[PDB]
Amino acid sequence: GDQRFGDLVFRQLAPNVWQHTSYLDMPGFGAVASNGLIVRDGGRVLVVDTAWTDDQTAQILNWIKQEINLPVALAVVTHAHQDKMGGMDALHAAGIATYANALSNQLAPQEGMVAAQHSLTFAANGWVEPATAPNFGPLKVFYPGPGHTSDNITVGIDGTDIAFGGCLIKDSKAKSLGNLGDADTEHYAASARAFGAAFPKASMIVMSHSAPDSRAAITHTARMADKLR
Amino acid sequence: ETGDQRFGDLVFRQLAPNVWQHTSYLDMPGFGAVASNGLIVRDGGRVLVVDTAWTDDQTAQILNWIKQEINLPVALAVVTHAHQDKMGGMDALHAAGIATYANALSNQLAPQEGMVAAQHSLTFAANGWVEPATAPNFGPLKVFYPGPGHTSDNITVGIDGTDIAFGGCLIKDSKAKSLGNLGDADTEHYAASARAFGAAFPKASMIVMSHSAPDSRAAITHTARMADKLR
Ligand SMILES: [Zn+2]
Ligand SMILES: [Zn+2]
Ligand SMILES: [Zn+2]
Ligand SMILES: [Zn+2]
Ligand SMILES: [Zn+2]
Ligand SMILES: [Zn+2]
């Protein structure tokens, strides 16, 4: 089911949804995968997360041209770290409208990232303010609270079984929560639980640094996070 | 101390013709007391409040002093993050009929932090400035989100037409040895957030903060210098 295309891997998850995967060598870790999503919505394609690099991100656009052949209407990026935002220039070079949590955009310069063009804001219950998410189609954006980072956001894919936890969620086989360097250890557990509650019927949980898992990934992550506080 | 006024457990100091600092104290028997400061602003025929006191009773004491001393209606309050010193008195504000505003994030965190949420949520652009439709009829209050620092949700307030800017718990005074309550702090971004506050209110010469008396702009650069060491 995996398709190799250059140094990237693509996996179809549903009739209109694919997972993109890109790799970066990290000392002591070796080659580290990061996953995002590609969604076909009518005559448009919507992207969740860049690849680690601009060149890899341009390859996502090339793959889309070959396999889907619809224009990319927008991309949303799920926090200000390299695996999610490292390829912003490739999107901007291509004239693609980009969106991130306002806070991600504010942190981007400190994090060595290029800010997205547009900022999302959120209600007190975590749901995106819809005026700030123009023509997002099936992408349903939820801010679960601080966890992996202060700015981390999540995305449900309406009309499918899929929700995307980004780097907040790890799979049920994980022994750790990954990079906690920028994490909120007090609030991480509640944020993970809030993600689950926000998308209560998603059965396929996609995440940045594990292959897709069932809903146990959410609970297992929350329980690991309980031990941080 | 001369010129300061007392009402119950609260102390008030006039900082400018239309601006007072409110000070309340959390007593922890056996140790002493922790002061927290907020602001009261007279804006023509109404009053605006920045931050509650630690408790509902203390906050009601603020409101009664306002009635006694200023005798204008309190239109709204802005609270600057979801911790007890800033939001502990929300129920008293609501019982008094005062409309309450906080960062959306403060409102989201409030249940976990044991606080009552504000009635309305403020949101912010990527440059930190409040999205104006979320802060209707705020008069001279200019609300700025400097980034994560003391907490993820901390906001700051400048008072237009005055030399005053309020850093809340983000800013410490310029003789401080440390940054104080770092339990919920963002150690990586704190220094940048402090600096961003300074740049947002570049002409403010009186810096008001939660846990020190008013200082000059030196408080900002000292805070940032201390914060640089957390990284
Ligand atoms: Zn990350
Ligand atoms: Zn990641
Ligand atoms: Zn960082
Ligand atoms: Zn605080
Ligand atoms: Zn405080
Ligand atoms: Zn806390």
The distance of Cα A58 from the centroid of its chain, to the nearest Å, equals 17
Q: Which residue of A has its CA nearest to B120?
A: A124
Per the structure, the count of domains in chain B is: 1
Burial class (CB in 10 A: 0-12, 13-18, 19+), A181: exposed
Contact yes or no for A102 and B123 at CB 8 A: yes
> In which residue are the tokens 């008001």 written?
B208
- Closest by CA to A119, choosing from A110, A129, A109, is A129
> Which residues, in sequence order, are bridge partners of residue A37?
A19, A48
Q: Is A118 known to sit in a ligand binding site? A: no
Residues of A in contact with B155 (CB under 8 A): none
The DSSP annotation for chain A comes to -EEEETTEEEEEEETTEEEEEEEEEETTTEEEEEEEEEEEETTEEEEES--SSHHHHHHHHHHHHHHT---EEEEEE-SSSHHHHTTHHHHHHTT-EEEEEHHHHHHTTTTT-PPPSEEE-B-TTSBBPGGGSTT-TTEEEE---SSSSSS--EEEETTSSEEEEETS---TT-SS-S--TT--TTTHHHHHHHHHHHSTT--EEEESSS--B-THHHHHHHHHHHTT-
Please, which experimental method was used? X-ray
Residue A30 sits at the vertex; the CA angle it makes with A28 and A33, to the nearest 5 degrees, is 125
**Separation between Cα atoms, residue B112 and residue B97, nearest integer Å:** 25
- Give the up-direction half-sphere exposure of residue B222: CA atoms within 13 A in the CB hemisphere: 15
Burial B109-134 (b: 16+ CB within 10 A, else e): bbeebebbbbbbbbbbebebebbeeb
Neighbours of A91 (CB within 10 A): 26
The two three-digit tokens of residue A86, written as one number: 């490292």
Residue B118 carries which DSSP code? P
Contact yes or no for B121 and A123 at CB 8 A: yes
For A66, list phi and psi in degrees, rounded to 5. Answer: -75, -45
Domain with B79 in it: 1-231
Say if CB A169 and CB A142 are below 8 A apart: no
**Separation between Cα atoms, residue A109 and residue A27, nearest integer Å:** 24
**Separation between Cα atoms, residue A80 and residue A61, nearest integer Å:** 21
Neighbours of B23 (CB within 10 A): 21
The DSSP H or E segment spanning B220 is helix B218-228
Say if CB B209 and CB B51 are below 8 A apart: no
**Separation between Cα atoms, residue A104 and residue A113, nearest integer Å:** 9
**d(CA A123, nearest CA chain B) in Å:** 6
> Which residues, in sequence order, are bridge partners of residue B167?
none
The resolution in Å comes to 1.5
Say if CB B21 and CB B44 are below 8 A apart: no
Q: Is A187 known to sit in a ligand binding site? A: no
**Separation between Cα atoms, residue A48 and residue A156, nearest integer Å:** 11
Residues of B in contact with A189 (CB under 8 A): none
- Closest by CA to A192, choosing from A139, A154, A160, is A154
Say if CB A8 and CB A17 are below 8 A apart: no
**Separation between Cα atoms, residue A189 and residue A79, nearest integer Å:** 18
- Closest by CA to A19, choosing from A208, A218, A215, is A208
**Separation between Cα atoms, residue A31 and residue B230, nearest integer Å:** 30
Say if CB B121 and CB A123 are below 8 A apart: yes
Q: Report which bound ligand comes closest to the CA of A112.
A: 3
The two three-digit tokens of residue A146, written as one number: 């601080």
CATH number, residue A125: 3.60.15.10
Neighbours of B42 (CB within 10 A): 18
